[PDB]
Amino acid sequence: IRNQEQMKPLEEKQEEERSKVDDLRGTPMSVGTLEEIIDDNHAIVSTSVGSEHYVSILSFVDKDLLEPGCSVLLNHKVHAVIGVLMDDTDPLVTVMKVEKAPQETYADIGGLDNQIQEIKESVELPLTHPEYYEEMGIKPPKGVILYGPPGTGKTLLAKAVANQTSATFLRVVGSELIQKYLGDGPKLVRELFRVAEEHAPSIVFIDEIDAIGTKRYDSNSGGEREIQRTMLELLNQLDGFDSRGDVKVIMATNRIETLDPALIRPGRIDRKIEFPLPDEKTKKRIFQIHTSRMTLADDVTLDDLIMAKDDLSGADIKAICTEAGLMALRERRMKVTNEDFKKSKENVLYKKQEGTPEGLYL
Amino acid sequence: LRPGRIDRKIEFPPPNEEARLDILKIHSRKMNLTRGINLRKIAELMPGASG
Amino acid sequence: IKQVEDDIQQLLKKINELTGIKESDTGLAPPALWDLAADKQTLQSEQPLQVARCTKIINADSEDPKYIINVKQFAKFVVDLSDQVAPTDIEEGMRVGVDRNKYQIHIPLPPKIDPTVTMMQVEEKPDVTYSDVGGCKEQIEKLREVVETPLLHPERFVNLGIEPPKGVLLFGPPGTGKTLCARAVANRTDACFIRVIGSELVQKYVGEGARMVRELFEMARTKKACLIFFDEIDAIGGARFDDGAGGDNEVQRTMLELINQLDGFDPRGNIKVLMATNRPDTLDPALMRPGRLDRKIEFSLPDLEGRTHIFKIHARSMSVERDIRFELLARLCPNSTGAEIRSVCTEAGMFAIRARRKIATEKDFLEAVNKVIKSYAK
């Protein structure tokens, strides 16, 4: 009954309002742009029509949804605001894909275990535990650096981590920020930061660059100016605003001794993560998972191929199997033999080396 | 060059005497000329040279 | 339940506005809407400009009564008798006044010393106050005297007949509290902190760069009492004397343009400039020279006692057991600036968290030094 009472005057009032908007809404409706916001009940507008008319805003749309430089709808002869335009373009920034929860996990690699705890404690752990950060009173590191011969576990570990962590992953290719155009490169780094802030919490994966390698002793040079001009703005963004979790940074570089200590800045980055070289046991572990996928046979001697191997990371190993698997496929058999493994192990050995040895230190 | 950012990298052979004979044949099917010519001789006349 | 109420809210506002638009529609009207983000009991009647947008321009003058001032590509039309009252201040255009170009057209409001259009970061008051003081201690003492004191007690300086500097310079590594210090005074001093990134000002096409420098200064003048924070000016700060060799000229033009405004006819006003360099050496003698740059405020290797104050700041958040003393360790530890001193502490809390303890320990501290000593050397 209380409802009925509100309802009796309301229904008509409800219709009347809809009639009133329709009068404004009436075709056509021209897009135009709000130049700037003059807070003493004014604003600057640029019209590509002709007439402009200073109006009071409707109550559906407010000025709190108006931003400077925004697109809005104007009528073509009473030039008034029906609504703000709701059609926005593509992020124009440098190469990015955003992905929520990727397929892969970190249970597939093995024997690498220690490194895996390091990223764990930094990134994953505060999300899991508020109050452990409160006791200590501090943030886990803003960002980490993963360093090794290009992604054989660096790349693997990142993919895995995004699923775990359950926030948006954005992967940016850093070389692509470099442009030989005066405006372009700086605009991009500032758009990259802009994009982060909206999507927060978010993970930033920075793929290695050439441009983080050079600082010299000048702060800018008559050489390629842009690479350092850009390098600086990376720093300004970082040392201007610290995140505990709003942005998490994964940085990647082939060698970290290329980097600059300016770039690190202690108290943002405290963690430097190093992939050990191939260690003999590890090779067998990594392998056992790769063979499982594939056909296997009772004439395979798993150790013998691993033993024959020395200083080869998981990628070549993943590769050997794939190569061999192709040979088999040509034979139109799904049975694997020793022979297959031998030719593939030889091809990859042939290609990496032509050097001479520095051993025999005994 | 870092492996697994690679799959197959395939050689393309530098041309040869057998090869040259049959490209010449393909080309000839575009234009009209005499019948009773020995083309076999003609490829041989050629040293090495591109397709 | 909520819905009934929301519908009633649209409708009541609509009826009053429809009457007002019908009325405003007659005789036409300025740029096209009202946005409020101040108060309605303070309303300006001077509005910013550098070009004159006109839409009607109704006025009172004898030589004609609806005079116009444009410069626009199509309709650059102007007064029919020079310098006769036209805009009605900022009536029917909201920035109608005068054109920078000139056609001997009336000026009720200037094309310079205005905020106009911008791309700016203005950053309302911070929250930080003391967070690395101890060796940042000297830098604080001087910065207050230069920036704060003239604004607090100007009347005193006049009696003496002394005028305070216009700019101070910051150097050493950023994010060590060199950076913090500028925000920490900005919050205390209560004057707008305006952040311009010099590197951004750099543009793809010439003359634009100068234009920007100029715009900044016009806004700066209007507001009197403001701080211009220049982030790592060296991009368009000095290095350079070589006089071009291929677009080392374009960046040099900006550097020279700034000098003109500083050394020029303007005067200081209540405007303060904070400059940020890596090593000050880079910068050119013109940038260094008195009659713009006078005080250079420095950073330093922090004394032992100092380190302790920083640690003291940190120890309020961090659960501790005080029966051990960090200063003894600190003498043994590498001498390093403020940022490493906070970082070792921060590292210390983690070890606890793994240990499954809630209070600090003597044990944690030993560990931190080995990593940190490694981290500078990469």
Q: DSSP string of A32-92?
A: EEEEEEETEEEEEEE-SSS----BPPPSSS-TTS--TT-EEEE-SSS---S-B--------
Q: From chain A, pick out residues whose CB is under 8 angstroms from the CB of C40.
A: 41
CB contact under 8 A, A13 and C340: no
Bridge partner list, A37: A43
- Select from A327, A344, A351, A354 the residue whose CB has the most chain B CBs within 10 Å, as the one to mutate to test that interface: A351
Rounded CA gap, C121 and B23, in Å? Answer: 68
Helices and strands per DSSP (H, E), number in chain A:
12, 9
CB contact under 8 A, C235 and A225: yes
Contacts of C339 (CB under 8 A, 6+ apart): A265, A266, A267, C132, C173, C175, C176, C177
Q: What are phi and psi of C199, to 5 degrees?
A: -65, -35
Rounded CA gap, C93 and C57, in Å? Answer: 7
Which helix or strand (DSSP H or E) is residue A127 part of? helix A125-128
Q: From chain C, pick out residues whose CB is under 8 angstroms from the CB of A7.
A: 4
Rounded CA gap, A296 and A309, in Å? Answer: 19
Q: From chain A, pick out residues whose CB is under 8 angstroms from the CB of B5.
A: 150
- Say if residue C19 carries a ligand binding annotation: no
Of B2, B3, B5, nearest to A348 by CB-CB distance is B3
Rounded CA gap, A46 and C31, in Å? Answer: 8
What is the DSSP secondary structure assignment for residue C96, as one 8-state letter?
Answer: -
- Say if residue C108 carries a ligand binding annotation: no
What is the DSSP secondary structure assignment for residue A259, as one 8-state letter?
Answer: S
Helices (H), chain C: 2-25, 137-143, 149-152, 154-160, 178-189, 198-201, 208-222, 248-263, 285-288, 304-314, 326-332, 338-355, 362-376
Of C35, C240, C340, nearest to A37 by CB-CB distance is C35
The token pair at C238 is: 């000095």
Residue C12 CA: distances (Å) to CA of A50, A305, C8, C9: 31, 83, 6, 6
Contacts of C202 (CB under 8 A, 6+ apart): A182, A183, A186, A229, C209, C235, C236, C251, C254
In a 3-state reduction of DSSP, which class is residue C34?
coil
Residue C70 CA: distances (Å) to CA of A106, C49, C54: 67, 12, 7
Pick from A339, A336, A316: which is nearest to A325 by CA?
A336
Q: What are phi and psi of A271, to 5 degrees?
A: -115, 130
Residue C339 CA: distances (Å) to CA of A180, A310, C23, C138, C345: 35, 43, 63, 17, 10
Phi/psi region, residue C321 (left: phi>0; alpha: psi -120 to 50; beta: rest), is beta
Q: What are phi and psi of C35, to 5 degrees?
A: -135, 135
CB contact under 8 A, A318 and B4: yes
Neighbours of chain C (3+ CB pairs under 8 A): A
Rounded CA gap, A172 and A251, in Å? Answer: 10
Rounded CA gap, C201 and A183, in Å? Answer: 9
Closest approach of A293 to chain C, Cα-based (Å): 36
List the strands of the sheet with C293-297, edge to edge: C121-123, C192-197, C226-231, C272-276, C167-170, C293-297
Pick from C257, C112, C140: which is nearest to C198 by CA?
C257
Question: How far is C-alpha A58 from the chain's CA centre?
Answer: 40
- Say if residue C137 carries a ligand binding annotation: no
Which helix or strand (DSSP H or E) is residue C229 part of? strand C226-231
Rounded CA gap, A172 and A174, in Å? Answer: 6
CB contact under 8 A, B3 and A319: yes
Rounded CA gap, C126 and C186, in Å? Answer: 7
Rounded CA gap, C260 and C263, in Å? Answer: 6
Apex CA C377: angle with CA C374 and CA C378, to 5°? 80
- Say if residue A153 carries a ligand binding annotation: yes
Rounded CA gap, B26 and B33, in Å? Answer: 13
- Say if residue C118 carries a ligand binding annotation: no
Sign of the alpha-carbon dihedral angle for A343, A348, A350, A356: negative
Contacts of C152 (CB under 8 A, 6+ apart): none
Tell the residue number behind the tokens 């677009």, with chain if given.
Answer: C247
Rounded CA gap, A94 and A177, in Å? Answer: 6
- CB burial string A192-216: b at 16+ within 10 A, e below: bbebbeeeebbbbbbbbbebbbebe
Bridge partner list, A55: C33
CB contact under 8 A, B2 and A149: yes
- Return the number of other C-beta atoms located less than 10 Å from residue A315's C-beta: 21
Rounded CA gap, C98 and C261, in Å? Answer: 22
Q: Which residues of A touch B (CB under 8 A)?
A: 149-150, 152, 315-316, 318-319, 348
- Select from B2, B10, B11 the residue whose CB has the most chain A CBs within 10 Å, as the one to mutate to test that interface: B2
User: Do chains C and B meet with 3 or more Cβ pairs nearer than 8 Å?
Assistant: no
The token pair at C150 is: 């003239």
The token pair at C338 is: 């403020």
Rounded CA gap, C251 and C238, in Å? Answer: 9
- Say if residue C178 carries a ligand binding annotation: yes
R_g of chain C computed on alpha carbons = 28
Closest approach of B12 to chain A, Cα-based (Å): 18
Residue A160 CA: distances (Å) to CA of A106, A129, A289, C85: 5, 20, 16, 71
Contact with chain A for residue B9, Cβ under 8 A: no
Pairing of strands A168-173, A96-100: antiparallel
- Return the number of other C-beta atoms located less than 10 Å from residue C87's C-beta: 25
CB contact under 8 A, C179 and A57: no
Neighbours of chain A (3+ CB pairs under 8 A): B, C
Give the residue from chain B lying closest to A313, CA to CA. Answer: B3
DSSP string for residues in A193-214: HHHHHHH-SEEEEEE--SGGG-
Given a contact cutoff of 8 angstroms between Cβ atoms, the answer to whether A204 and A172 are in contact is yes
As to burial, measured by CB atoms within 10 angstroms (0-12 exposed, 13-18 middle, 19+ buried), residue C67 is buried
- Return the number of other C-beta atoms located less than 10 Å from residue C95's C-beta: 25
β strands within A159-253, DSSP E: 168-173, 202-207, 247-253
Pick from A145, A156, A152: which is nearest to A311 by CA?
A152
Rounded CA gap, A266 and C377, in Å? Answer: 12
Number of residues assigned to chain C:
378
Pick from C376, C271, C10, C63: which is nearest to A15 by CA?
C10
The token pair at A101 is: 């929860």
Sign of the alpha-carbon dihedral angle for A332, A336, A339, A343: positive
Rounded CA gap, C142 and C125, in Å? Answer: 21
Rounded CA gap, C254 and C206, in Å? Answer: 10
Rounded CA gap, C212 and C202, in Å? Answer: 9
Given a contact cutoff of 8 angstroms between Cβ atoms, the answer to whether A82 and A75 are in contact is yes
Given a contact cutoff of 8 angstroms between Cβ atoms, the answer to whether A269 and A143 are in contact is yes
Rounded CA gap, B30 and C220, in Å? Answer: 78
R_g of chain A computed on alpha carbons = 30
Rounded CA gap, A304 and A249, in Å? Answer: 41
- CB burial string A80-118: b at 16+ within 10 A, e below: bbbebeeeeeeeebbebeeeeeeeeebeebbebeebbeb
Given a contact cutoff of 8 angstroms between Cβ atoms, the answer to whether A256 and C361 are in contact is no
- Return the number of other C-beta atoms located less than 10 Å from residue C27's C-beta: 9
In a 3-state reduction of DSSP, which class is residue C82?
coil
Pick from C271, C286, C204, C194: which is nearest to C237 by CA?
C286
The token pair at C24 is: 């405003």
Sign of the alpha-carbon dihedral angle for A321, A325, A327, A331: positive
Give the residue from chain B lying closest to A318, CA to CA. Answer: B4
**What is the three-state SS of A290-336?**
HHHHCCCCCCCCHHHHHHHCCCCCHHHHHHHHHHHHHHHHHCCCCCC
Question: How far is C-alpha A54 from the chain's CA centre?
Answer: 44
Rounded CA gap, A232 and A185, in Å? Answer: 12
Rounded CA gap, A118 and A250, in Å? Answer: 12
Q: What are phi and psi of A143, to 5 degrees?
A: -150, 165
The token pair at C219 is: 């806004």
